[model samples]
Target chain A: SGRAKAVARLSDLLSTDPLGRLTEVEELLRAHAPTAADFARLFEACAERLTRALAEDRISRMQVTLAYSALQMALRRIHHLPDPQKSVGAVLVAGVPGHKPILEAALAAEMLRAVGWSTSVVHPESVAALAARLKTSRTSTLVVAPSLLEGTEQEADTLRFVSALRARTDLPGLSILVGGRLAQLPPSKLKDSGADAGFAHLALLPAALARVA
Target chain B: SGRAKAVARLSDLLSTDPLGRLTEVEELLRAHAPTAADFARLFEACAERLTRALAEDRISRMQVTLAYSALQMALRRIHHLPDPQKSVGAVLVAGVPGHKPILEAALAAEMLRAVGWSTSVVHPESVAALAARLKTSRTSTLVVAPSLLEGTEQEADTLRFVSALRARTDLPGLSILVGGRLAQLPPSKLKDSGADAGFAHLALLPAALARVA
Candidate 1:
C-alpha cells in the first residue's frame, strides 16, 4: 500500500546514505506534483508513523534528525520556482530563536514556493532587526512564522515575534501566519497570540491570508 | 584588554553580517598562529562571559546560536592542513543523538587539524556503523568524543556511544577521549564511562592520547 510505501520511503530518506536519496525523492514528489493538501497529507501521515516509532523506541533520534534534514533538503530541491508574471506576493519565512533547530519554517517556505509564491528565509536577532528586514525588502504581504524546532520555548518566542511584528506601524497590511505544530490552532485560540491566523496546511493559507490582509 | 577584546570579537562573530566575519577572524588567528592552549583559553574565556550574560538575561538565545555558528565557521576556515611527513594520526569527529547540536565536536576536529593531526567528521547511525568507520579508515589512535551541544541529554547518549565503541574488539588499541563541557570531568570521575580520558582543552589531547593508547 502507498501508506506503507511512504513509511518505507521516509525510512530510506532518513538513512545516512552518501547520495542522500534527495534526487530520488525529489523526482517522486515532482512526478506527482503534490498539491498543498497532498503535501500536508504526506507530512502529517509520515509524521504520525515516525512519532509512534520514536515513542516505541523503534527509531533513534539520530534517524529522526537525518530524516528531517533530508526531507527539508528534498523539499527545497523540488522548489524550482517558475517565474510568476504576477506574483501572488512573496513570503518572508522566518525562524525565531529556539532551543533547537528543525528547519520547519524553511520547509514551509519551499512549500510556499511550490504553490508559486516568492519565499525568502530570514533569521532576525531582534524585533528591530526583523522589522528592518521586512521594511527593507520587497516586503511580503505575509510573514510565515514557525518554530524551527518542536518546543514551547521556541513557540513562545515565535508568538512574541508575531505579536511584535503585528504591532509594527511601518509594515502595514502584513499578515502574520503562525505555523508548525501550532499551525493546528484555531483562529479563536490564536486571537490573543497576535498572529492573524494559525494554519495547518499550505492550502489554507490563501484564505487566511485574504481575511487577515 | 584581550579579555574584553575576545568578548567583543565573539559578539561580532555572532552577527548576521553579509561577509560573515569568518575571513576576518581567520586572518587574526592565522597571524597569531594560536597554539592549542591559546585557542582553548579564548574559547573558555568567551564561554565564561557568554554564560554570565545569558544567565543575567543580557544576551538572547538567538545571539548565542549565531555566535556558535560563526565561531565554528571561522575555526573551519582557519583549518589549513599542513602536510605532515609522518602523520601523527587522523581524528574522526562525530556527534551522537542529542537534544541539541553545538558543533563542539566538529570544532574540536578542526582544532585537532590545527595541531598537526588529520581529521574527519563522521555521522554514524549506529555503533556498528561507527565501528566500521574506524576499522576501515586510517583510524587515529584516539577518538575524541564530545557533545556537539552543551547538555547532559546529549552527554548521556555520547557516553553510551563511548561504551558501545569500547566493547568492540575489532577496533582494539583505540583510545576514547570524552570532551566538550564534559571535558572538565577528571579521569577518576569518568572511570566507568568507557572513556580513557576527559580533557578540557585541545593541547591536552596529545598527551592523553599517548597515555591512553
Candidate 2:
C-alpha cells in the first residue's frame, strides 16, 4: 500500500503540471527519502517508471530529463555529503524577487546544505534591497543564480548590484559566488555580474561552497 | 651540527644580496628538511626566532608577518597533503610580466604543488598573453594573484583582461580565481576585474583547488 501510494503521488504530481509541482515533489521526496540510499532507490524506481512511461508515450523527454536531474541531485548530495556538519555561519541563495526560482538553482542551495552549510534563499527587489539584507544578515556566503539574472539589461543590473554590494563595508566576511548557466559563460561573465565566484553547473556548487568556508 | 650548517648557509645567502640568496636558501632548506614534520619543526624554530628578533627590533613587523605566513603555510600543507598527489596539471600565477613575483604569490603556487597540485607561475606581458597561455595549456584552473596585479591601472587592465578571456570560446573548461589583497576587496571589485571567484586569503587555495579538480 505504501509503495502503491508513493507511485500514485509521484505520477499525480508529474501529470498535473510541470513547473508548479517541482517544489511539491522536492518536499515529498525529501520527506520520504532521508538517506542517499533511499534517494538512489527512488531514482532507480523513478527512472524505470519514467522510461516505461516514455515508451508508452505518456511523458515527454524533457520531463524525463528534468525528473532525472532531480534524482541525480539526490545521489550527488549523498556522494558529497555523508554527515550533517556545520561549516559556515550562514548561506543565502539570492535571486530576482519577482521570478520563480529554477529547480537547478533550488537544488544548488540544497547541495550546499547537504555539505553542512546553513543555507537560506532570498529574492530581493533591487540591488539596494539585496545589499540591505546582506549588510544586516550574518550570511558569510551569498550565492547568486542565473535564474535571478534573466533580463534584457541583466549586465547593467548585475554591475549595479555588485557595485552596491562592494560599497558596503559592514559585510566584510561575505563572499559572493554565482552559479547555474551563467557559470558556463566564462569568468568574465561572472565578473560582469559582479560575483566573487562562478559555477558553470550546479554540481560545482558543493566544491565552491566548501572552499569559501 | 645541522643547525649550524643551516644557519651558516642562511647567513651566507642573506649576505649575498637577497634575491639570488633566496633561491640558494630555498634549495638548501628543501634538501635538509624535505619531510613535512621536518618542515614543521623548522617552521616552529624559525617563528620563535623571528618573533624574538622582531621584539628586539632586529626585524621589521612586516618581515615577521611574512615569515609567519611561510611557516603557517608549511603547517597548512602538512595538514592538507600528507602525500603530494597531483590533482591539476599546471597552475599559472599571473602578474605584471616584468615584475618579480611576490613571495606570498610564489608560495601560494608552491603550496598548491605541496598539496598534490602540479603548479606553475607565469608572468605574462598582457591579458592576451595570459589568455593565449590558458588556451594552450591543459591546466583547468588559472589562479590570478595580487603579485600579478600591482597599482591602480592594474584593476582596469584586469577588467579588460577578464573581458577578453570571457569573449573567447576556446577555453570553456578553464576556471579563474583571484586571491590575496585583491580578493579582500568586494565581490563587485573581483567582477570588475573579471574573475570567476575571489578568495580573501591564500589559505583557501587548497580547498578551492581541490574542488575545481
Candidate 3:
C-alpha cells in the first residue's frame, strides 16, 4: 500500500517538470522506503512509469538513472544499518564529487568503525583521482557513498566513476560496494552502476564483506 | 619494579648472545608492559641497553630500530585500549613483509572496526607498491605495523618503505603512523623510520587520529 502511494507520488512528480521536483522525488523515495523490499516494489512501479516518461520525452534517461540511484540508496540504508558489534574488515568509503558531501563520507567511515571495520574515506575531486586510489588500494571492499541521487546530472557522473573503478584490472580482487541512498536498487540497477554488491546499511555490511572476502 | 626486573633480564640476555636472545627480549618487553607508564619505563631501560649493544657490535642499528619499534607498540597498547564507545574515523593498517603476520593486520582491522573507526589493511610486498597506495589514498591517517626487531634482516625493508612513503609530495595530507612491536622507540627513533607518529597500541589510535584530524 505504501509502495503504491510512493509510486503514485513519483509518477505525479515525473509527469511534472522533473528538474523542478527532482530533489523532492529523491527525498520522497528515501523517506518512504524503510526497507529494501518496500523500495523494490516502489522501484518496479517507478521503473514502469519512467519508461513511459522517457518515451514521451517528459523525462530523459538521465532522470530515470538518477531515480534508479535514489531508490538504490533507500534500499541500502534499509539493508546495512550499522552494528557496533559486527567485525567487518577493511573498507574504502568513497564519495561522489558533487552528489555526496565529505561529511557524509566521514560519517560512513565512523559507521564502518562502529561495526568493526577498517575504513578510509576518499573524497576525490575527480574520477581520475578515485580511479588511481582504487588502482593501488589492497583492501578487498570498496563502498561508494553518494548523497541521495537528487539531480538529473550526477547519475552519469557517478556511473562514470564506478565504471572506471571497475575497469581497473589491478583491482580485480577488490569488491566494489555501493552504499548511502543508492543501495535501494536491485542487483541489476546496481550492476548498471558497475558495483559488485550493495552494503547500504551497516547491519548488512558483514554479509557483504563476507561475500567479498 | 617490573621495569627494573625486565631491564635486568634484557641485559643478561644481550650479554650472553644478542642475536639469539633478540626474539626473547622482544617478547619479554611486549609481555611486561600492560600500561603506558610501565611501557615507558621498560622502553627507556631497553633503549639504554640497545644503544650499548649497538655500540659494542653486539647488535646492529637494524636491531635497535626493530627493538625501538617493539617498544612503541608496547607503549601504544597501553594508550588506546579499544573502546567500542569511542567514535573514531577511518584508518589504514599496514604491515611489514617479513616481520608481522598477515593475521595480525587482519586482527588490527577487526580491532579498529570495534572501536568506531573504518579501516583498510594494506600488506604490500614492496615499498613501491605501498608508496603508490599512500600517494593515492585519500584517508588522513596511515598506520604502519612492523614486527619487532627479531630477525637477522628486513629492517632496511621497513625503513625504505617508510622513507619512500614520507618522501612522496602527493601524500602531503596523509598522517603516517607506526605501531605493533616495532614502534617502541622514542620519538627520535620513530622519526628515523619516517612515520608521522607512532601508535604502538590500538588504545593510542584515537589520540593519534585526533592529532592528524
Candidate 4:
C-alpha cells in the first residue's frame, strides 16, 4: 500500500501541469502539518530522495538543483539554513572522448555550488574551436588533463599548446582546472608556466573554486 | 643512394665493428661544426630521436633516458652542448588511465627533464594513497584531480576514502599540485583540502608549483 500510494502520488504530481501543481504541492504540505517545523520533515525526505536519485544517475545533471531545491524547501520549512547562499559562478568542463570529463565537470560544479560557486560543463576540443563559436558561456572552468587526449604524445606539448592559446586570448579570471591522471607534476613546473591552481579530484573543487573567487 | 649509404655506415658501425668508425663519425662532426651553438642542434636531434622512440612505444618507461644517453654519445662527437649540465633533475609526472595518463606522464617527464627535472610517473590512483605510504625526500610533488577518477562509482569512493586517510597523515611539504578535471574548483577549495597549488592543465602546473616553492 505504501509503495502503491507513493507511486500514485508521484504519477499525479507528474501528470498535473507543474505551473498549476506547484501551488497545490506547497499548500498540501503547509496545511497537512499546519506548521513550518512539520514541513521541514517534508524537505528532509525530499533531500534524501533527490540525493539517492542523483547518486543512482536516475536523474540528469539538469535535475540536480530541482532535487536540491525540493530538499531545501522541506528543510527550510522546518528551519532556516545558517548560510543558504549558492555559488554565483559557473563551471567550465572539457576534455575529448569518454565520460570522465562530463562526470568530473558535473560533480565539481555541484560541489562548487554546495560551497557557493555556480557551475556547468563543456566539451574540451569544442570549447575554443566550437563551443565559443556557438556563443555558449555555460562553461566557467576547464577540467582537462592529457590522459583525456594525446595517446602517444608528450604532456608538455599539451601544456605548450594551452600556453599558446592563453597568450592569444585575454579572458581574465578564466580559471583552468587540470584534474585527472596527469595532474601530478612538480609544483615548480605548474607555477612557472601560468595556471592559477591545480587539484587532484572534484571532491575538493568547491573549496578550490572559492579560492579562485 | 643516401639511405643505402647511411644504412651501410650504420651496419658497419655495428656488425662490422669498424675499429675507429664511431670515433671517425665524431671527428667528422667536430670538423664540420666548430661552435657550442652547432652542438646544441645535435643535442636536440638526439633528444628528438629518443622522444620518437618513446612515442612509438618501442621502449618501456624505464628505458627512455638510458636510450637518450646512448644517442647523446653519438651526438656528443658531432658537437658540444653550450651548457654541458650533467645529471638533469627528475621530472614530476602525474598519470591517468589508458592513453591519457601514461602518455602525458611520459611526455611531461621528458619535457621537464629537457628543461631539467628528472621525471617520475605516478598514476592518478597512486597519488593520494601510495604517496602517503612512502617517506618523501627532495620534496617530490603529487599532481592530481579527484574528478578524473570519479568517473566510476568505485573510483569516487576509493579516492574519497584515500583523501580522508591522507588528511590525517603527518605528511608535510608534500608540494601538492592539484589539476586535471577536479581542479575546476577554486584555489580556496584546493588549499582547504590540502593542495599547495591547483590548475586545470599542465600548462598551469609549472607556474603554480614555482609559486609554492
Please give the fraction of native interface contacts (Cα pairs under 8 Å between A and B) kept by each candidate.
0.02, 0.00, 0.00, 0.00
Candidate 2 local lDDT, residue A156:
52
Writing each residue's lDDT as its tens digit, candidate 1 over A40-152 gives: 44655566666667778887766665555445435434433343556677777665634333345444554565556766656566678778878888575555544332332
User: Comparing candidate 1 with candidate 3, which one achieves the higher DockQ?
Assistant: 1
- Report the number of the highest-lDDT candidate: 1
Point out the higher-scoring one by DockQ: 1 or 2. Answer: 1
TM score of chain A per candidate: 0.74, 0.55, 0.50, 0.46
True-contact fraction in model 1 equals 0.02
Candidate 1 residue-pair clash tally: 2
Residues A14-78, candidate 3: write the lDDT tens digits. Answer: 55423223346556766875544344445546656877778788765555543443333233323
TM-score of chain B of each: 0.75, 0.54, 0.51, 0.44
Give one digit per residue, the lDDT tens place, for model 3 in B1-213: 766787888656544433223336446755875444444445445555775677689765544532343332222323333324444665777766545433234335545655577666665545676666666766677776544334435556666678777776666667777665545667887787777776665446556666766
Q: Cα lDDT of all candidates, in order?
A: 0.57, 0.54, 0.56, 0.41
Which one wins on TM-score? 1
Instruction: Give the C-alpha miss distance for residue A99 in model 4, angstroms.
Output: 8.6
Name the weakest run of 10 consecutive residues (lDDT summed) in model 2 chain B.
B14-23
TM-score of chain A of 4: 0.46
Question: In angstroms, what RMSD does candidate 4 have relative to the true structure?
Answer: 27.4
